[PDB]
Design a protein around this ligand. Structure first.
Ligand SMILES: Nc1ncnc2c1ncn2[C@@H]1O[C@H](COP(=O)(O)O)[C@@H](O)[C@H]1O
Ligand SMILES: Nc1ncnc2c1ncn2[C@@H]1O[C@H](COP(=O)(O)O)[C@@H](O)[C@H]1O
Ligand code: PRO
Ligand code: PRO
Lengths: 262, 262
């Protein structure tokens, strides 16, 4: 029963056939679905008459070509998961569907939250993300949008986006799903080798032991595991960090008081 | 009977009260209405059940502070004009209405048409224009948008905007209204003194006699009136130009074969 729309034309037809009365929920993703994504879909199914999920590996938000080339890809498994969850529509457009004439008009964020942390570490990422989310919102026109708290800055930027361009959509932020160790679920973690996972687990044991009073020292404890910390910052009541293990880039954020708790 | 909506809440009210049967025409402007604007309004009226006119002097598109400070302002006269045209809704928002948190998210054009002529001459103008136009379109959600050919690059850019962000609005381009001399009608014209007016007319007496085979000599003739030419160029089969008379910056474009006729 799941409808799979491989292109915009088909999708428009599908979208135009829904009555205003139906609550429409939307979950944007770049595929390679895990329990994090699934938690978002489950929330949206509990609150909407119609749930749409997108799968689109957005080229304009990849500041790193290798990251892009190696981004995990398993459409058939993804479809199987979405059908299992009774998702109503899968929108899985091509690049040319979303950027008919290339990336000519971009949303450019000019504010502090864009300039720090992920913004600083991934130049041009937030522009690409904001531009594709705006286009995906204009296409799907949902009542409700589901986002993970893991991408904390992304959440706050999309909130600003929906506010500034008068998009009549409610935003629902969902807690970060984690492994028992505390490591957040992430599609890139599929790229982690055997030993890398143990390293990731080392790090989260360190994080669950730490009071975050000495970031230089914690940085040193994290770097000794073999990982390479990119940044760690205490921002109000929340810790933000990002690091590499081998070629894999992992990010996280959590309440200082809780740690990456279960 | 014209409804004047000086804020979003007030505008959402009236907008949301319209039935789908009613074709909505939208004419955005920055106020100080002249026969140029009036022709667009008349076209919209002949083609729609509901006509909306906005008046909003958008600060983010003025690259020149003095230009912004002196930009003509005459809201009461504008209101009288619109009312005699039986315009259904005046949308006249404040800066705060349009930019609740300032100019934090901007549409940035990365393409050729934005990099030449007016785009090069007015750095950051097209970004301002596209951002406010996107907002206005998201607010008004019209069926038909009316734009003047005089702002040629603006038209092309707005067509790209409507395409890229999936706005279901038709764009109607309208002929440039002119003084008997050929001088385009423009709001900034109200800032011209009497002697400025005569320089402007001399420029157009020159243009009407020209074949444009030699822009160098044409530039010298225009500069000899006391005006200061910014640029003059052939793009495709049109002539594009912009010039200052005193502190007043005016632009024009027309087919090379016809010149600024009428
Ligand atoms: N481990 C997680 N827990 C909760 N939400 C997540 C998790 N990972 C990704 N998401 C959210 O899923 C959506 C798509 O993520 P991605 O496919 O990684 O771009 C975004 O709203 C993410 O923040
Ligand atoms: N002389 C004119 N003839 C036709 N349209 C015009 C003229 N001057 C301005 N417009 C259009 O009126 C709209 C508002 O212009 P403005 O208020 O100058 O920003 C734009 O679509 C302009 O291109
Ligand atoms: O790129 C990358 C996206 C940004 C949010 C999480 N995954
Ligand atoms: O000046 C300024 C705006 C841009 C289009 C015409 N007037």
């Amino acid at each position: 029963a799941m409808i799979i729309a491989d292109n915009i034309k088909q999708f428009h037809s599908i979208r135009n056939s829904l009555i205003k009365q139906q609550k429409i929920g939307f979950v944007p993703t770049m595929g390679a679905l895990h329990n994090g994504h699934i938690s978002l879909i489950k929330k949206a199914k509990s609150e909407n008459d119609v749930v749409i999920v997108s799968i689109f590996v957005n080229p304009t938000q990849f500041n790193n070509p290798n990251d892009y080339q190696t981004y995990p890809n398993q459409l058939q498994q993804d479809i199987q998961i979405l059908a299992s969850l009774d998702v109503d529509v899968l929108f899985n457009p091509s690049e040319k569907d979303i950027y008919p004439d290339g990336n000519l008009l971009r949303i450019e964020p000019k504010l502090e939250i864009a300039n720090i942390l992920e913004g600083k570490s991934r130049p041009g990422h937030f522009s690409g993300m904001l531009t594709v989310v705006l286009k995906l919102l204009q296409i799907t026109k949902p009542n409700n949008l589901y986002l993970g708290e893991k991408d904390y800055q992304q959440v706050m930027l999309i909130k600003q986006l929906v506010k500034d361009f008068f998009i009549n959509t409610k935003i629902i932020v969902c807690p970060t799903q984690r492994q028992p160790s505390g490591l957040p679920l992430s599609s890139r973690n599929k790229n982690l080798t055997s030993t890398d996972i143990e390293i990731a687990n080392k790090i989260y044991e360190i994080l669950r032991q730490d009071d975050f009073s000495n970031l230089e020292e914690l940085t040193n404890k994290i770097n000794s595991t073999g990982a390479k910390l990119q940044y760690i910052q205490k921002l109000n009541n929340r810790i933000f960090l990002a690091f590499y293990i081998g070629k894999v880039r992992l990010i996280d954020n959590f309440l200082k008081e809780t740690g990456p708790s279960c």
